[PDB]
């Protein structure tokens, strides 16, 4: 399927052993698409607390998705691990259960060279055959991906894009110019109406799963020329995402699905869970924004 | 006059001997305003190689620059410096000399406190007596004011606004919506189409001396809604930007001001003239956006 | 056993799979210690490309590193992992073998609050019972510990240390003085001189797999006083040093252990092996400094 | 030569940011005479001269260099985003007598290395003295590489380095490349560890009030007594981390203060010493006989 769209990063809930609940996760799944009326599921990404997990987990919640979800639901599966073998074992089960595209986390912690993240890319290809997007997030890794090493990265056929999580937007601008044919989907979810603007095919995001009908106007308004209408929404969204920020973003994003009758569980250690002192504030947050 | 609007960051021409080149100036004064069609000219900024400058030079620049163009200019006076006693005598003969409104960067070098910042604007201001825009450019001071730290600023009700030179369009975002009433004026060229979404009262830029007629259009069509073909005006914007950035920026603005029968000198040392090596493409650069 | 020392970070050689080459890493952990002559080894630390292994892998490497030296030797394992459940079943696995103490890198990747942190480390040791040395390398990280943070780490009985891989020799005077009864070992091999004189306990390092006679030299010469002596043998390290990093210094470092005839296998991808473009540097410095 | 121990020298000002030249006097005399320091480095960012205009930092020039006797070495810091202006205050503090000049590596500005070499060799060329680069990268956000010194150093006018940076790997490489060059290290936190790493000396704004221990330091650790040398800097980083934590150029002025010196305010817009810190400040004086 053509990747364009507004997708979910698809949060997991967790027991207190850090094992997951399988019934909330599809819940999640289902709320994603069923509720905020999101075209798809980016899985197993930053969001899914996917860094924290063991390889058995990672595949158990590329099934759970895949099975919670219709046909028509496009799926992005992010198989980045600093363990190449681990990202092959990962991408070629998403491939057999049907996933649309692989997506894989510049290689972090260590400092590798360009060459060195271009032939893991290159080799995760290689060993599935799937089409693989490119997860830009230098906040988190500190790897920057310049404008010549992403023609280099995108003279690869089956390099088919990038999931862009960064501040810069001349970078994305020079981006979206030098390859017109390549997919971008934005991570950013407090600057979607200006990557809307920047020409962007699409977003992935945690607080799609608890704002996704909002996103999709901001998304639409935006490239109607609505642009004041979609600025407001912004705003909304901002202090939506602001609020989440502040109490600690994936266990507060899975309590206001909780409000909605989800078994979210709590986050995986060592995330520590919401904390109930900020209890009062998301209630109000939750009220002023139907959430 | 209120003071939205287009300026140009106005360059200083420059003799062998880091003298100003009065006549030059005076033409890079009308340009901006005549050729370009801006609303006004910011004096003395980073732009105006203001910081390698003596106080009788900066001084010079003002009175030039004012004597250059008629009174229906918007003129903004830049005399932020380390020195508080020269902001000061810069505030008051800038004010004398009809300036609309004062400008001065966060003090940098020593790691001053919020405190220290904050005191320093209400000290300019105090002596000065005129409006002030705070200039906020943390990519070369180091310096980051918070939203709470906006709100104490902008409390004082002769601090109006402020030129907002970063990336972070979070923080923009949280500004406009904070400050409704206050005026923000973007200092980041190669984003003009992205902070005119964000609801910016207008820009300030060095490029704008050249591409004036662009960024109008681009900050014209997106504020109605025609945010394709403003994002088509940023590409080919940015196309100039990259490549000015490339050659070194402000002795490569003012060879395209060169171009137009200007006489543009030579940068103030430590900064090296533009270097020939160059000359074949930005004959080419000026040939293709016709500059 | 006591812990001072001089510790190799041990090496790992694999094959072209990434599997683990268990002849070559039990010559490697027998080089550090009966041809190095170093006290102990720090196994599944970074330089043993331990965050590239999956959990049976680390488990293989600390298996065969104890099974390769005898029990005279110290052995301290590192079990960090951003998998809270994987370090717990690796320190049972370790403490099980025998190594003399833990260790565990600061969580990374994810912005965890201190809090976080803290209990990361303190659920380590409640599960597994055995003595815990913080692992904090903030270059790579991006984590930094503050004083305060420190002492509240260090509160804790079984938090008998830290592993400082850190370049701030304020900061690691200021542990010093604060925390006389704790364990310091330095991690930055190329300031053995400075560490020593700053009160370090001993010292880990993965260039102590080639030049851990020199590095004994160092840290008892300083001790001794006869600082000259051991600052000359610290500027012939550093030419060591400089030359390895310049290199790709993991794989380099195998490298030099091959031409003792010891089967240096691979790095793990996406580690890439030694580019044969330094070989002849390299075979210069092996002769020029006898490793 | 220029070897030993420099006072950073601190400046008094009045309510209008003008010299107050009889503390100034003072200060001086306190570093050379009551804490036996080998010279004063005039005009750096200790004494807030990127705060003050042309005719203020000749009147500092002056007012030190008359303050003091004629074996007390003279290093004149007159780099400047203004080149002109480092050129006259160069040439100016060149006349006075003052034994080298120094400059801090042009900032604010994203210069390439070429403008930076450059800046430093027109000076040069302009004023016929010896140049000390002055390094402060966080402060300047402005980073030297090893092959970046061997340019500069291939100048026979760049006589040396005051190195206030972290990174002693750099130091050591900087040290082995150019065993003919002065360093002088101005993190004084790092004191001994810089001796021990081969420096020629120091300059640092903490020794106009603990220039003794600092001597102290730099002696015993050149004669391998290490262990009493890192018990002084322990002493002197409990006295650093208390002065930085309540605003390190006000406080070590009130320090003086307490000497009986009219150490008088900071330029603004630094903000005075704010007494909530007073008590702390008057234990911290007793505890190490300041």
């Known amino acids: 399927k053509d990747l364009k769209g507004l997708y979910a990063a698809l949060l997991v809930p967790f027991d207190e052993n850090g094992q997951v609940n399988e019934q909330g996760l599809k819940q999640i799944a289902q709320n994603a698409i069923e509720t905020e009326e999101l075209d798809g599921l980016y899985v197993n990404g930053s969001s899914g607390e996917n860094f924290l997990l063991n390889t058995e987990q990672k595949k158990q919640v590329f099934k759970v998705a895949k099975e919670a979800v219709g046909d028509k639901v496009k799926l ?5 691990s600093l363990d190449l073998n681990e990202a092959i074992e990962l991408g070629k089960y998403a491939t057999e259960l049907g996933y649309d595209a692989l997506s894989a986390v510049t290689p972090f912690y260590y400092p590798f060279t360009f060459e060195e993240i271009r032939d893991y890319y290159f080799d995760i290809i290689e060993a599935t055959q799937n089409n693989m997007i490119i997860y830009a997030i230098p906040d988190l890794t500190g790897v920057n991906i310049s404008i010549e090493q992403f023609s280099e990265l995108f003279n690869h056929e089956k390099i088919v894009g990038v999931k862009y ?59 109607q020329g609505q642009i004041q209408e979609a600025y407001q929404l912004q705003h909304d969204s901002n202090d939506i995402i602001e609020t989440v920020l502040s109490m600690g973003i994936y266990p507060t994003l899975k309590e206001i699905l909780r409000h909605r009758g989800i078994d979210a ?11 109930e002192a900020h209890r009062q504030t998301l209630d109000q947050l939750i009220a002023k924004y139907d959430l």
């Open 265 to 275: 569980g709590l986050p995986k250690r060592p995330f520590k869970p919401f904390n």
């Open 76 to 80: 992005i599966a992010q198989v980045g």
């Open 165 to 223: 999580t960064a501040p810069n937007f001349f970078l994305l601008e020079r981006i979206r110019k030098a390859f017109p044919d390549k997919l971008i989907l934005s991570g950013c979810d407090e600057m979607l109406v200006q990557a809307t603007i920047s020409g962007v095919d699409g977003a992935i995001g945690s607080t799609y799963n608890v704002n996704g009908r909002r996103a999709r106007k901001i998304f639409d308004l935006a490239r």
